């Protein structure tokens, strides 16, 4: 009955198709992924952290001469290029290889961001299962998550007790390193997160989001001091590591050189540089960050690098190879693993965007890498593919309207929601702000304009604000108003609704995502452990004659073969015919055509 | 009658498809025509073309050296689409933007817009005259240097030509409007660059002599391509009369740290200006280009955003944007760079049939060392031999083959030789040991035998003896310059040959075409006779004809309005009759059903 | 502009298909066109037409009576295709063979080639004038009598019309070329045949008054329709001035033994000549025909081999062959019979769309007594009501409904009313006893209300009381002659009505048609003004248009032949139109027509 349930799934998609793939491109009918051949595992940063704790560990990073490398392929990489649809099956399977083959990596960015949501909602899989599997794959590396400040893994500031609860459960789950950020770089709103992370005695890497151009004397709102002061404020707030999160890939090489020197003088803490390659030059910036003494940098495996993802890992490493700051990673292993992600990635054809290459346009719009495609789909969905260059100009007009602000998740979305509206409804900034021009705003903008996502430097422009709220705005810390959830009473409602006790981890998924979690749960009792199925089967079922292998339980392997399918019955139901370890089964499924 | 022939072309393609596109992905049905950007209407500021004409090539190179700003060459019109779209970019889309470049980006050093693969491909695959194309660009952009890539002794072909043919082609290129010749030999052999270099100088044109980059100067485990190899070559080329020295990093192998040392040293070994061409296969080429800038390089190449990245050049707009404000800021408006790229973006979508399946950067390049312009091509050649699932084995074998030949410079045409070696090794499951095994018969490819014979020139330590002895099957090799053994072409006799096959006089340009590509050219002229001046058609029409009911506007000399009204069934004669309206007048055009 | 009209039609049909044809089967692609037999081609031997013109009808009938050989009427031009091909046979195929009949079978009594369903169906589904058709047959066979079927007061229609309309119609048919009117009444009520009969006599044409056969005179358990019933009507009709008496066995019910008896008796009962028409649904009607001959009948009907058998007439060639060398040998060249039949076979293959699925003979016909011309139609009607699989129930119900109506003569239009009643009966699952039930309300068909009111006349003993009460749901019935009650149409005015609707003058013939079939005629007229003289197109082209690249020769007038090629057909444009590209005598012509999809 574990088996009957996956069989009902891999009859249903075999007949009906996967909704997320029904009418998107198919993969070339022609090369499955092969996990490379590999001993035991060299201790790494995971063991060091256990030995030193987070304060001392960060000091260790500061003192290391080699630049330390975070691999983002398992989170930002596919979040940026494949709409975050990368599956546990493909991620888990390669963890051992990282463990054995690249044991000096600082960390693996493998959680948080859009994965929590999407894993359940679009991929029928538990994110906590994914984390665990990776923990068991790679017990010698730091597992890194991206944590949105007040916003946890969701889109709006939550109650403090919910933020506390999630962070605590994240660490039990296997997270060692929390890169945490606030979408308007408001430190007050980070303090809850930062203290929570420290309580679990894990690494709090407090991020400063980069926007503007520090070397442009005509945009002095986002000058060097603005970054060096924020660094100092975060140190005082109890940070083990400082990150520069260049979410849009705006930091240029000359700027890196200046910024990173200044930062390392402002604070004694180690610094971690994260960026995207939408410009086509982010690697120059990264290398410059390295020349300037930066302690750690993020990159993505070659196969999932470039464009709106992070810059290419292997070439970065190659560029350092032999130099004082050489990071000591085997280029032949980087490739071996890259060839794997390339084979993995071909399975997700259905999710490729039509992005052809670098775009300096990014310096105009400041759209984050991990939004670009997502927003091009909302505009194609709003019937605007043709006017897309206007959408980008709207984003930057829209951005200026708000007083010029940090655009990262979820503020990025708010500005996304505004630009789209403006193009559709043919509105200028000066119409938008006008008093005798009637326009209904996207709930998202009312939300942010009242103060639900925080407060930028000089606050919000008074006039835009009055016309959106039609409702007195507030300027305090959002969760300093928000009543504490009743964790015992918000539990009953999901245990009476799934008629089951749930895990402390399941409860956390609910806090963050009541309905997504709920719908996920109902599915798992129906279809079972679909995560254990290879990615072409999950997405397209089993072709006539085909023979599949899957492990339900460790060391228990099921041989499933689609032998036949029927025509649709007068009931409406179709019958698939299998052979489960030489034992015939008939699985009847409905026809949703 | 020019109208009759274009109609015949449209009917043919409308019914039978274009052979190069019938069976490939089509562009999106919606598809905005590329729109030439409207210009604010200011006149054309004298730029590098005027200076060259004033000072001649030497003083111009001096002027390059002394310019503080870095000078950009834009490669979109040539290396850009050679690397990303199999060189299929048409004149129609190329010439329409020339004037925009001219008005908007007047400080550019040059447009790389000619030579390379364009000469061949334009005739053989697009049915258009590359001399026409250059003429149209010349006339669009009279203030900018026009730049070609010339393969030293290999002309715009694949094989060493007689000297007097090389001389004649270079003479016609100058005449056609090339100002700046980047000239390279595939084994970096100066002895085999002298005829070309001398010919360019004799035309009072810019001779930019290239040194191809390979290996890694900063890796002491690979000393053959060390720093002193490049600086000695720079000096040898100065003595041979170069006005400019290029570093042609055809595979995008040069790393940033290596650029600091390389450009600093080059500019101390010679007073001539330096010009750096690279490729972004690694994903870090913009880093190398900036390092080269920080180190005083005089000029760098880039491609417009929309045709940059990966196997093409690194992104022009983003490189400019990174220099904005610096001492060596190149002085180019980014807004106009974005506007031109927007056009190239719309142009590029029309070429969906020729997009490769390459998803992004690859550090594997530091292993294989495939030039950017070959990669995709080789990868198709492999596919076509049923080796798609073994691409990485082909890359590995390409590296091994490289070492087996003694570690050579791989660029057109040496790179093809190595690619043929690798395909064979994989199809036939041979290791290098097998390849040179005394007990194993191997039918080496002809390009490899020809290489080892001497026909492409001498690499600096000669060819490895045992492989050579085995590949030549008894034939004696030579170490002289291949053109020293070629019979001088009988120009007058040859011109008469082609004038008789075509029953008419041909032009001096057409003759250089014939001398470089006899079959291809002859085929191109015979097509032109049948189909008229197809280059004037917009690109969708050139590849897909006209849809039922479609209205098309074309410029014969007069703008033709052409409607497709109906297409008959295939007749008893195997003919299909297309029923056009030509400016309200009815025209029935019969073509054959080639299914 | 006649040409443009035709090109529009051909464009229309080529792109959109013909509604009568688009869904049913197609003929063979290879399809040998029908070839008109070569003629040695001296003149035409004077035949029965000349005789009638010389003698007048009284004396011509007396000549028939005295004639030793049996005389033959070929029914292939009317009853043959009406019975087998839903009356869809076209003027083109019919006129083209007239001349061959004329040269090769000049001893034929007549050609049945008009009346019946042809008048309606011609205009309604074939877009052609039935008078044009009659005129063309006239032109080609001036030596043979042309014979129509007329339905008494029903005219060529389904109901009793006013007298003046019946008179006016008879006048035109005679003028148009009808020499011999076989006229019948569907309840064999002679009173209702008098107005028809007198009109025909006024025109000095032949009035072949029909007696319709039903039941079995040799079955004594069925006395109503006995030997004397028929001999009495023969006499009653002689006194009403018939020139000839027909026995019209519409359902092919007469058996050989009954013929031996019947035609002996008829000949003694009246001095008029006797003419026998039957159908071969039973698979034995030839035997009945030959028995009728043997017993002294003067004329019999047969259909050409290639349109004989089953629901049509029995086989002419084979009958003539049985009589060959006999005392009453009919003197018809069989070889020519065959040649003409071969032409009709080739003609018939063009009409594959309208083949029914009847396989062979059925004795079931003795049970249901469905006219041979109705059998298939009712079968289609029943499919249309989703009753294919119960067809035998419908056949029994027709037999049950017959007995309920008081056991009647079923022939057009009475046959049509019994049909409707049977179809209702089976759909709605009623016994006879339900239709005749007080406490079961039943919504009868419009045609049955009409018949029981008395709009088709009266049967020998009237209509059964209670069917009439329950059915008329309050209306008083009459037992008089419908025509005696119908306001006599106003002709001068009605002419104006139709002439106003067409913005043009009409002809007397056209006018007769409008009096018969107002809407159908009005529709056919408007179609002619759009599409031109489509009757002149050969049949494939009429039904299917022109294949891509196909060339067509079409005779617009006798003189002028248009060469038409279909060269191309465009995709559908944004206005929903399609342009067809024709060559007309070497000249290019765009005709636009709508995409009716
Ligand atoms: Cl939710
Ligand atoms: Cl050639
Ligand atoms: Cl009517
Ligand atoms: Mg450090
Ligand atoms: Mg300079
Ligand atoms: Mg007689
Ligand atoms: Zn990111
Ligand atoms: Zn290149
Ligand atoms: Zn009949």
Alpha-helical regions (H) of B48-111: 48-66, 81-84, 91-104
Task: Give Cβ neighbours of residue C228 (< 8 Å, ≥ 6 apart).
Answer: none
Three-class DSSP category at A123: coil
Interface mutation vs chain B, best among A337, A349, A357, A384, most B CBs within 10 Å: A357
Sheet holding A583-590, edge to edge: A547-553, A556-565, A573-580, A583-590
> Given the DSSP bridges, would you call strands C110-115 and C71-74 parallel, antiparallel or unpaired?
parallel
Residues paired with B244 in a beta bridge: B208
Query: What are the structure tokens assigned to B222, written together?
Result: 């690979």
| DSSP string for residues in B238-274 | HHTT-SEEEEE-TT----HHHHHHHHHHHHHH-SS-E
User: CA A411 to CA A405: how far, in whole Å?
Assistant: 9
User: CA C153 to CA C155: how far, in whole Å?
Assistant: 5
Q: Is B33 annotated as a binding residue?
A: no
CATH 3.20.20.70 segments of chain A: 64-351
A71, A76, A117, A404: the active-site residue = A76
Residues paired with C110 in a beta bridge: C73, C145
Residues of C with CB below 8 A from B572's CB? 549
**Resolution of the coordinates, Å:** 2.7
Interface mutation vs chain B, best among C547, C566, C567, C573, most B CBs within 10 Å: C567
C413 φ/ψ angles, rounded to the nearest 5 degrees: -100, 0
CATH topology of domain C355-473: Cyclin A; domain 1 (1.10.472)
Residue pair A162/A208 in contact by the 8 Å Cβ criterion: no
Instruction: Please provide the CATH number assigned to the domain covering A352-470.
Output: 1.10.472.90
Tell me how far apart the terminal alpha carbons of chain C are, to the nearest angstrom: 27
Does the distance separating the beta carbons of B325 and A360 come in below 8 Å? no
Query: What are the structure tokens assigned to B562, written together?
Result: 């052409």
Residue pair A427/A421 in contact by the 8 Å Cβ criterion: yes
Residue among C174, C188, C196 at smallest CA distance from C242: C196
Signed CA dihedral, C533, C535, C539, C543: sign only: positive
Residue among A254, A259, A293, A253 at smallest CA distance from A277: A253
Mention the CATH class of domain B489-532. mainly alpha
Residue among B79, B362, B371, B361 at smallest CA distance from B251: B371
Cis bond upstream, residue C413 (ω within 30): yes
CA of residue A476 relative to chain centroid, distance: 28
CA of residue A556 relative to chain centroid, distance: 32
CATH 1.10.10.60 segments of chain C: 489-532
Q: What is the DSSP letter of B503?
A: T
Signed CA dihedral, C205, C206, C209, C210: sign only: negative
User: Breaks in chain A at C–N > 2.5 Å: after which residues?
Assistant: 30, 38, 470
Does the distance separating the beta carbons of C581 and B572 come in below 8 Å? no
Does the distance separating the beta carbons of A252 and B322 come in below 8 Å? yes
C526 φ/ψ angles, rounded to the nearest 5 degrees: -70, -35
CA of C148 to nearest chain B CA: how many angstroms apart?
47
**C-alpha distance from residue C428 to each of C378, C394, C572 (Å):** 17, 12, 46
Flag whether residue A305 sits within 8 Å of chain B, measured between CB atoms.
yes
User: CA A1 to CA A3: how far, in whole Å?
Assistant: 5
Task: Give Cβ neighbours of residue B91 (< 8 Å, ≥ 6 apart).
Answer: B122, B126, B128, B132, B133, B136, B535
User: CA B197 to CA B241: how far, in whole Å?
Assistant: 7
* Environment class of A515 (CB within 10 Å of its CB; exposed 0-12, middle 13-18, buried 19+): exposed
Query: What are the structure tokens assigned to B35, written together?
Result: 């729109």
Task: Give Cβ neighbours of residue A535 (< 8 Å, ≥ 6 apart).
Answer: A87, A89, A90, A344, A347, A348
Cis bond upstream, residue B413 (ω within 30): yes
Residues paired with B248 in a beta bridge: B212, B277
Residues paired with A297 in a beta bridge: A69, A273
CATH 3.10.600.10 segments of chain B: 1-30+533-595
- Could you tell me the CATH superfamily of domain B1-30+533-595? pyruvate carboxylase f1077a mutant domain (3.10.600.10)
Query: What are the structure tokens assigned to C57, written together?
Result: 């009808």
**C-alpha distance from residue C203 to each of C52, C56, C172 (Å):** 13, 11, 10
> Given the DSSP bridges, would you call strands B575-582 and B559-567 parallel, antiparallel or unpaired?
antiparallel
Indicate left, alpha or beta for B554 from its phi (over 0: left) and psi (-120 to 50: alpha): beta
Three-class DSSP category at B127: coil
Three-class DSSP category at C400: helix
Residues 535-574 of B with CB under 8 A from C: 548-549, 565-569, 571-572
Q: Is C151 annotated as a binding residue?
A: yes
CATH 3.10.600.10 segments of chain A: 1-30+529-593
Active-site residue list of C: 79, 248, 412
Residue pair A85/A122 in contact by the 8 Å Cβ criterion: yes
Helix axis angle, C118-126 to C518-531, nearest 10°:
40
Q: What radius of gyration, in Å, describes the C-alpha atoms of chain C?
A: 24
CA of B535 to nearest chain C CA: how many angstroms apart?
28
Residues paired with B300 in a beta bridge: B72, B276
User: CA A145 to CA A383: how far, in whole Å?
Assistant: 35
User: CA A303 to CA A354: how far, in whole Å?
Assistant: 16
Give the Cα-Cα-Cα angle A448, A259, A312 (nearest 5 degrees): 85
User: CA C271 to CA C274: how far, in whole Å?
Assistant: 9
- Interface B-C, measured as beta-carbon pairs within 8 A, has a size of 31
CATH topology of domain C1-30+533-597: pyruvate carboxylase f1077a mutant fold (3.10.600)
Query: Do chains C and A touch, with touching meaning 3 or more CB–CB pairs less than 8 Å apart?
Result: no
Three-class DSSP category at B61: helix
Ligand nearest to the CA of B518: 2
CATH 1.10.472.90 segments of chain A: 352-470
Is A485-528 assigned to CATH 1.10.10.60? yes
Task: Give Cβ neighbours of residue B223 (< 8 Å, ≥ 6 apart).
Answer: none
Alpha-helical regions (H) of A138-248: 160-173, 191-199, 224-237
Tell me how far the alpha carbon of residue A150 lies from the centroid of ligand 1, in angstroms: 17
User: CA B44 to CA C204: how far, in whole Å?
Assistant: 104
A566 φ/ψ angles, rounded to the nearest 5 degrees: -90, 165
CA of B325 to nearest chain A CA: how many angstroms apart?
8
Three-class DSSP category at C407: coil
Residue among C508, C476, C503 at smallest CA distance from C492: C508
B280 φ/ψ angles, rounded to the nearest 5 degrees: -105, 20
Residue among C42, C498, C84, C153 at smallest CA distance from C303: C84
Ligand nearest to the CA of A154: 1
User: CA B564 to CA B543: how far, in whole Å?
Assistant: 15
User: CA B253 to CA A319: how far, in whole Å?
Assistant: 10
Largest CA distance in chain B: 76
Residue pair B230/B268 in contact by the 8 Å Cβ criterion: no
Q: What is the number of residues in chain C?
A: 597
Residues of B with CB below 8 A from A253's CB? 287, 290, 322
Instruction: Please provide the CATH number assigned to the domain covering A1-30+529-593.
Output: 3.10.600.10
Q: What is the DSSP letter of A485?
A: P
Q: Is C412 annotated as a binding residue?
A: yes
The 3-class secondary structure across B9-32, one letter per residue, is: HHHHHHHHCCCCCCCCCCCCCCCC
Active-site residue list of B: 79, 248, 412
Three-class DSSP category at A329: coil
Query: What are the structure tokens assigned to B305, written together?
Result: 């955003």
> Given the DSSP bridges, would you call strands B71-74 and B575-582 parallel, antiparallel or unpaired?
unpaired
Q: Provide the Cα torsion B427, B430, B436, B439; round to 10°.
A: -100
Residue among C59, C205, C231, C204 at smallest CA distance from C145: C205
Q: Provide the Cα torsion A117, A118, A122, A128; round to 10°.
A: -80
A274 φ/ψ angles, rounded to the nearest 5 degrees: -125, 135
Query: What are the structure tokens assigned to C84, written together?
Result: 């087998």
Residue among A65, A55, A458, A479 at smallest CA distance from A235: A55
CATH 3.10.600.10 segments of chain C: 1-30+533-597
Residue pair A273/A324 in contact by the 8 Å Cβ criterion: no
Query: What are the structure tokens assigned to C217, written together?
Result: 């005179």
Signed CA dihedral, A479, A481, A487, A489: sign only: negative
User: CA B460 to CA B425: how far, in whole Å?
Assistant: 25
Interface mutation vs chain B, best among C551, C568, C580, C583, most B CBs within 10 Å: C568
Q: What share of chain A is helix, strand, coil (3-state, %, to 5)?
A: 50, 15, 40
User: CA A389 to CA A395: how far, in whole Å?
Assistant: 10
Q: Which residue of C has its CA nearest to B571?
A: C549
Query: What are the structure tokens assigned to B48, written together?
Result: 């590098």
User: CA B446 to CA A309: how far, in whole Å?
Assistant: 43
Kindly report the number of other CB atoms within 10 A of residue B155's CB atom: 24
Give the Cα-Cα-Cα angle A568, A571, A574 (nearest 5 degrees): 35
CATH 3.20.20.70 segments of chain B: 67-354
Mention the CATH class of domain C67-354. alpha beta
Residue pair B567/B160 in contact by the 8 Å Cβ criterion: no
User: CA A136 to CA C191: how far, in whole Å?
Assistant: 109
Instruction: Please provide the CATH number assigned to the domain covering A64-351.
Output: 3.20.20.70
Helix axis angle, B285-294 to B316-323, nearest 10°:
40
Signed CA dihedral, B137, B141, B143, B147: sign only: negative
Residues paired with A550 in a beta bridge: A558
The residue behind tokens 């990025």 is A412
* Environment class of A59 (CB within 10 Å of its CB; exposed 0-12, middle 13-18, buried 19+): middle
* Environment class of B352 (CB within 10 Å of its CB; exposed 0-12, middle 13-18, buried 19+): middle
User: CA B244 to CA B62: how far, in whole Å?
Assistant: 9
Alpha-helical regions (H) of A238-281: 253-266
**C-alpha distance from residue A42 to each of A37, A106, C236 (Å):** 17, 13, 125
Residues paired with C569 in a beta bridge: C580
H helix or E strand, kind and range, residue C393: helix C391-404
H helix or E strand, kind and range, residue C594: strand C587-594
Residue pair C594/C576 in contact by the 8 Å Cβ criterion: yes
Task: Give Cβ neighbours of residue A470 (< 8 Å, ≥ 6 apart).
Answer: none
Detail the DSSP E strand segments found in C97-142.
110-115
Helix axis angle, C414-427 to C446-453, nearest 10°:
130
Sheet holding B551-555, edge to edge: B551-555, B559-567, B575-582, B585-592
Alpha-helical regions (H) of C503-559: 508-516, 518-531, 539-544
Q: Which residue of B has its CA nearest to A216?
A: B325
CATH 1.10.472.90 segments of chain B: 355-473
Query: What are the structure tokens assigned to A469, written together?
Result: 């709220």
Task: Give Cβ neighbours of residue C446 (< 8 Å, ≥ 6 apart).
Answer: none
Residues 68-87 of A with CB under 8 A from B: none
User: CA B289 to CA A280: how far, in whole Å?
Assistant: 12
| DSSP string for residues in A425-464 | TT--HHHHT-SSS--PPPHHHHHHHHTSS---TT---HHH
The residue behind tokens 């999809």 is C597
CATH 1.10.10.60 segments of chain A: 485-528
Q: Which residue of B has its CA nearest to C571?
A: B548
Q: Is B82 annotated as a binding residue?
A: yes
Q: What is the number of residues in chain A?
A: 593
Across B512-534, b (16+ Cβ under 10 Å) vs e yields: bbbbbbeebbbebbeebeebbbb
Residue pair A263/A224 in contact by the 8 Å Cβ criterion: no
Tell me how far the alpha carbon of residue C512 lies from the centroid of ligand 3, in angstroms: 12
A273 φ/ψ angles, rounded to the nearest 5 degrees: -110, 125
User: CA A549 to CA A555: how far, in whole Å?
Assistant: 12
User: CA B402 to CA A192: how far, in whole Å?
Assistant: 59
Q: Is C530 annotated as a binding residue?
A: no
A272 φ/ψ angles, rounded to the nearest 5 degrees: -125, 120
Judge whether A211 counts as a catalytic residue: no
Q: What is the number of residues in chain B?
A: 595
CA atoms within 13 A of residue A282's CA, in its CB half-sphere: 34
Q: What share of chain B is helix, strand, coil (3-state, %, to 5)?
A: 50, 10, 40
CA of B86 to nearest chain C CA: how many angstroms apart?
35
A228, A409, A417, A535: the active-site residue = A409
Q: What is the DSSP letter of A109?
A: E
Give the Cα-Cα-Cα angle B137, B139, B143 (nearest 5 degrees): 90
Task: Give Cβ neighbours of residue C596 (< 8 Å, ≥ 6 apart).
Answer: C15, C16
From the list B565, B571, B572, the residue facing C579 with the nearest CB is: B565
| DSSP string for residues in C292-338 | HHHTT-SEEEEB-GGG-SBTS--BHHHHHHHHTTSTT-----HHHHH
A295 φ/ψ angles, rounded to the nearest 5 degrees: -85, -30
Query: What are the structure tokens assigned to A395, written together?
Result: 């984003």
Residue pair C118/C517 in contact by the 8 Å Cβ criterion: no
Flag whether residue B302 sits within 8 Å of chain A, measured between CB atoms.
no
User: Breaks in chain B at C–N > 2.5 Å: after which residues?
Assistant: 557
The residue behind tokens 């100058």 is B174
| DSSP string for residues in C411-465 | -TTHHHHHHHHHHHHHHTT--HHHHT-TTS-----HHHHHHHHTTT---TT---H
Kindly report the number of other CB atoms within 10 A of residue C191's CB atom: 16
CA of A25 to nearest chain B CA: how many angstroms apart?
12
User: CA C239 to CA A222: how far, in whole Å?
Assistant: 123
């Amino acid at each position: 009955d574990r088996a009957t349930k996956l069989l009902t799934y891999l009859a249903d998609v075999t007949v009906n198709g996967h909704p997320e793939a029904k009418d998107r491109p198919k993969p070339l009918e022609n090369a499955r992924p092969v996990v490379p051949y590999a001993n035991g595992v060299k201790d790494g940063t995971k063991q060091l952290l256990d030995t030193l704790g987070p304060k001392k560990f960060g000091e260790w990073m500061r003192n290391e001469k080699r630049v330390l490398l975070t691999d983002t392929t398992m989170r930002d990489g596919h979040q940026s290029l494949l709409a975050t649809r990368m599956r546990t099956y493909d991620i888990a399977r390669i963890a051992g290889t990282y463990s054995h083959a690249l044991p000096n990596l600082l960390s693996l960015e493998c959680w948080g961001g859009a994965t929590f949501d999407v894993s359940m909602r679009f991929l029928t899989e538990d994110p906590w299962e994914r984390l665990a599997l990776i923990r068991e794959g790679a017990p010698n590396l730091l597992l890194q998550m991206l944590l949105r400040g007040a916003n946890g893994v969701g889109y709006t500031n939550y109650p403090d007790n919910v933020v506390k609860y999630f962070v605590r459960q994240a660490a039990k789950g296997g997270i060692d390193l929390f890169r945490v950020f606030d979408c308007l770089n408001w430190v007050e709103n980070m303090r809850v997160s930062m203290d929570a992370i420290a309580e679990e005695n894990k690494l709090c890497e407090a991020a400063i989001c980069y926007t503007g151009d520090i070397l442009n004397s005509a945009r002095p709102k986002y000058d060097l001091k603005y970054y060096t002061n924020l660094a100092v404020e975060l140190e005082k707030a109890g940070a083990h590591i400082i990150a520069v999160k260049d979410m849009a890939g705006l930091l240029k090489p000359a700027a890196a050189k200046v910024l990173f020197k200044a930062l390392r003088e402002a604070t004694g803490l180690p610094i971690h540089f994260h960026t995207h390659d939408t410009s086509g030059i982010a690697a120059a910036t990264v290398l410059a960050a390295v020349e300037a003494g930066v302690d750690a940098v993020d990159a993505a495996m070659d196969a999932l690098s470039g464009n709106t993802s992070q810059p290419c890992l292997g070439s970065i490493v190659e560029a350092l190879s032999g130099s004082e700051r050489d990071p000591g990673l085997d280029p032949a292993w980087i490739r071996r693993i890259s060839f794997y992600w390339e084979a993995v990635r071909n399975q997700y054809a259905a999710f490729e965007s039509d992005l052809k290459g670098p775009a300096s346009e990014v310096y105009l719009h400041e759209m984050p890498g991990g939004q670009f495609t997502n927003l091009k789909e909302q505009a194609r969905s709003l019937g605007l593919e043709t006017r897309w260059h206007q959408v980008a100009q709207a984003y930057a007009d829209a951005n200026q309207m708000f007083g010029d602000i940090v655009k990262v998740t979820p503020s990025s979305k708010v500005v996304g929601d505004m630009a789209l509206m403006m193009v559709s409804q043919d509105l200028t900034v000066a119409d938008v702000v006008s008093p005798d021009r009637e326009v209904s705003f996207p709930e998202s903008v009312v939300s942010m304009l009242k103060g639900d996502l925080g407060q930028p430097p000089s606050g919000w422009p008074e006039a835009l604000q009055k016309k959106a709220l039609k409702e007195k705005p507030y300027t305090v810390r959002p969760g300093s108003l928000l009543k504490e959830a009743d964790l015992d009473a918000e539990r009953k409602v999901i245990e009476k609704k799934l008629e089951r006790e749930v895990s402390d981890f399941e409860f956390a998924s609910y806090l963050m995502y009541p309905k997504v979690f709920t719908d996920f749960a109902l599915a798992s009792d129906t279809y079972g452990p679909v995560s254990v199925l290879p990615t072409p089967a999950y997405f397209y079922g089993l072709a006539d004659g085909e023979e599949l292998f899957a492990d339900i339980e460790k060391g228990k392997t099921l041989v499933i073969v689609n032998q036949a399918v029927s025509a649709t019955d007068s009931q409406g139901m179709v019958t698939v015919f299998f052979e489960l370890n030489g034992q015939p089964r008939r699985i009847k499924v409905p026809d949703r055509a």
